[PDB]
């Protein structure tokens, strides 16, 4: 029977050296799962909050309090519920907390118990996690968007765009897409030296070069794609993560390249980009409060490229409906710990699917060796995933799990290449 | 293990007294599931065809050779595959047939094996058939659309619309919706008798009264809703199945009630109805091939009411993509035996979900005691179902299974009442 | 072991849209059963009464009270008893009620538990339900008496005979008997349309057209048997359900065809019928209390035809003995919910077998998808069954179960054709 | 599963010191049953034939041939069939033999395999043999007819009535009936010992002293009933086994008491006996070929007493129907080894039940420690049994098994006292 028997959390380190929670939900059979909770650099005004300790131990980022919360309250508050009733246990937790942010118990503890009971309600039925969460029709492997060149708010250099990404949309299978991504990565690693630059990896495995400007960055990436042995656009596309809030001074314009600009000027810059490069997707092109500018930019360049809402929505359905109404952001970005539980992620991704919006399962800055977002991007059939460059094995664990998923499917699997970027 | 061991097939009678196929896929453990294949009154030009015997036995509708196809070819052609691989087994069947409409082996000998395999890839995992096919987030109970008054191509009457339906959209739960539907049904049964009419049940349990004109029928239905104790629009809505192909003389026009009309006139009729009555959905309003007329009518009234494509699309993805891009019919009916497999069913419903189209799991004229379409309407989360009037227990078995589903969910269940008809 | 662990009831809809009880009796060794209780409208004075709610819900036909009788009282009153002791559990229930007609707990809340434990005292021994109740020698498949024409108290028509039935007594097996019945039923659907009559199905799937007198109806049936490809008498016989109580005015006489008659006149009408048509059985020829007229009728025609007591007995043994004494009809209908338990059913059928009376398992007006009476008609070896026309799959589910039974027996099965009607 | 795996046969001694066959059937599911075949001396022309060895070993009564027939031919001919399919295996045996008497393989070997298969099927279902062979409604305990006074063809005495039996019809339960029978037996033993008469037990444990005549014998029995403390007729009744064939010279007449007389005078003697004594049953009152005399006697006294056909029928259905039609012998005597299988036994007892005839499971002269006929008399619900006096533990094993059956039933059991002898 899939009824929870024990729950116990411990405190571990994430990929950045900061503590995080790890929950281990056992079942009355012997099914013993384990799920670690990722954590972002910060938190806006609408996400679920992490319950950090605060003080001097671990730089004020200890999670002994969330561990204690799991071990004292969340433990017996679910022991005895039905594992396969994800909508039972998740509402149980959300009411046990009682706040709109899960502040009393922290989003990290709630999410840890949610994910571990899901991994036990998939281990129980002997299904694999992607098959359980997605059913029988879970067969699509996503297009990996590999952030190879970092800039903007990361390396404090002359670049303003945050993440430059490549996407092997032309591959025949997923394993060839992973090969092409790794080859473009290792080609850029040498183009940097052949242009006198540095090879210091950021937090996603991407590079931190001191290149002139945005256009120079895209040109460097295109040179690396050509040097790999591929054809830009037909084999490998490009993508952007503008992260506009990092350079938008409220009351003034966006400060880009050393000039103050309006939303119209940024839209003109994006149109000039869409011109000379095979861009398929831009993420957070304007600030998360400039709804009118977002509608303007969506109407202007929203038929030729994907528009991802990373900050303007925080995987909250209540803001997603509003953004659907005003005609902004034809794509969502699903981060599992910005909403706090599996069920709410599934509901938000449903709501964004039935509105004409593509979704994209995404990673956090501090990840672990947990490979659940791979299974989750296969299950919901998003056809896109954003989980870093092929380096820093907290990013590569996801790609390895997707390889195993494809191998386990076999003839059933399908690579979602070029069916995920019609524009 | 979920590996098929033994497959059998026999010939049984459907709800109308015609033969049909019943398959019994067995697993190595002992999992033993049976599934009967429904069948429509006629097989069109894009469906999968049924492999009838032909001749003089059973009026030429015997299925003794679709029973033989399962026992001589399909049995060993699937024995040994993996149950949880719906994609695998369904592609195996589709290639073993080798035709664009499954004619060599019949679109009934294959669907039986598909379904009875899915009823064991869910019986094995000990999940219930609705939790398997839809995952963990399968919680939405659909709005029953009850066909209480039949007309048009069903009986000799001056009525031109095929099926008049009621929909209890204002109920708090599903069980109260079923109660309201049954009460409206009995109220109408009393009203017809009190107004000197007949109570002869059709093939769906709906009535065949000798009333004059469409408007009088909607008025009778509103009077029955009032007499039941409810209020139209706030508690119970209305719906239509025009089935207008049944009176469109090609090159002449939609001749009905003694008036030859163009596509424009039918739109005016529908606008008047939508104004004077609380309609929420009209099904097949114009014709199977009048694409331009469909685009016109969708532009005219296609945002104040639901437009269901029953015949213009045949649950075929290839025609569905065309109807999407041409902007017609923001809804479709999902009849499982017009496509041939469970897999292609899920694929078409996905393709129509991601296009802004609501779906509606529907029944056939000849059904059986098989209650699979209930489990399937709650798994895909359609939020609508069309399975006849609360009579003729081949139609009530579905409602009983939905009651059991709602009871098995518990507090997790949600009734999709009023959140399926925004217009 | 076969010891009852849980019992739980719910409220579902029957084939006519009225509520009924559905009980589920789990055992310790898994063995989860369910059994729905049928319910007929025409309740007399000696049967067990149904515990309806009364009020405004469901038109006063709710059964929320009988669902409580099972969940609060009947549940623990049997939890712990032995399943294979039908006598034990059924006497337990009959004493726990304490009334001569089970009125305190309802003759529907009790029969559900009886039938469900009998379905678990066979699912336990892994025997099939027909083999358990009848032992090792349960091998006889019954002749189906298919009701194809409805008249009398059913529709506005000049006929006073209630049900006109055909019986394929000349078939080699049961499958061919079902085929011949379905073919006659589909032939009559044309002979009606080929004479300007209506095809509105009643409550048993039989037609309710406007014909002139009994003789014209029997002639239509003979024409349909001829048009099917068979020959009357040698292949298909005839049967009658004279519901003569429906036209007997106490103290005035049987008003038949518009001419007041006495018992002698009705006997003369029956004797004239026995000449021109191959009738094999008539049920309820005169009335419930007209004992003297019956003993006078079972002597004039009681040698050349079967006389079935449908209302003169209500499956009550106490009435059945006194009927055996007075030289009254030589057959009875076994309706399981007019007596209240399986045990008393078996006892009454035993008492009527040894008296030289043939039996006939029969259906109710409101049935469900429960196919128990098929197993019961095979087990007791009645050699006759009356379960409606081959339509309305609440009636066809029984025939499908009899087909499954016949192929599960194998070479052991025997069709009781023409050995059930010696006269 | 209930599929036969091994069949063995050995040669043992019966209660009289003659060899007989014992068959042991081992199922594939561990079940291991053992059954021994009784054998009587007096064999007519229609019973099954016992396959004896013939020669000088064991006086020509060896059964090594039947043992070898089971071990070489029947074993593999049934190994693999389904236990619960009694009719399957029994038709298999009857065709494997190929003769109308089973003489090629002997009725004893076939019956041994049949009975051991039934015992293993009952042991498999975990039901006890009476519950299996009778179903759920097997609850009636039979009235033991105890043969206490032997005469006629058994010893040198002036009596022509073969068996004098007492029947405790007035007991409240079965255990009190057995007590009353044993007490009457010991009282008669004392009454005989007082009169210097012989106390040498026959083959049934009953005495055979040199009494004057039939009337003196019945008077001695009545004295013994009075001396026990009971009331003749109200507590204990009487019964006869005349076996008139043992004193009917064909063409001369029944030489009774030393006065040759016709059937009419024998009927007069029986009428006088019935008048002056509480006789409830007479067995074989006339010869087994004098059908007309039997009809005369049945008309004369055949409603004031039970007329048991022991030799006029040999448990053969084909002779039973002929005796039914001519109005003779309103009772049957079921000996299991005169027909050859359990299936044909059940069929003949059914045929005699549905004709107004009571049945009576009976024993043979050479019995064994096998107590199967007790279970069989409970299962078929005969309400009578004839298995000797309470002595000679091959007769008492049956009564002990009936005690255990009653104890296992418990509150469900019913003693068929005084309900089995209306007249």
Residue numbers in the entry:
A (entry chain C), B (entry chain B), C (entry chain A), D (entry chain H): 1 to 423
Paper text:
Enolase, a ubiquitous enzyme, catalyzes the reversible conversion of 2-phospho­glycerate (2PG) to phospho­enolpyruvate (PEP) in the glycolytic pathway of organisms of all three domains of life. Here we present structural snapshots of Mycobacterium tuberculosis (Mtb) enolase in apo, PEP-bound and two 2PG-bound forms as it catalyzes the conversion of PEP to 2PG. MtEno has a topology similar to other enolase structures, a smaller N-terminal domain and a larger C-terminal domain. The crystal and the cryoEM structures (enzyme in solution, frozen) along with the biochemical studies clearly demonstrate that the functional unit of MtEno is an octamer.
The octameric fraction was further used for structural studies. The structure of enolase in the apo state was determined using both cryoEM and X-ray crystallography. Freezing of apo–MtEno and PEP–MtEno at 3.5 mg ml−1 was accomplished with glow discharged Quantifoil holey carbon grids (R 0.6/1, Au 300 mesh) and a Vitrobot Mark IV set at 100% humidity and 16°C, with blotting for 3.5 s. Both the apo and the PEP–enolase data were collected in the Titan Krios at the National CryoEM facility, Bangalore, with a Falcon 3 detector in counting mode at 1.07 Å pixel−1 sampling with images exposed for 60 s, with a total accumulated dose of ∼27.70 e− Å−2 and dose fractionated into 25 frames, with each frame having a dose of ∼1.1 e− Å−2. Particles were extracted with a box size of 320 pixels and subjected to two rounds of 2D classification followed by 3D auto-refinement, per particle CTF refinement, B-factor weighting with Bayesian polishing and refinement, and subsequent 3D classification in RELION-3.0 with D4 symmetry imposed. The nominal resolutions of apo–MtEno and PEP–MtEno were 3.1 and 3.2 Å respectively.
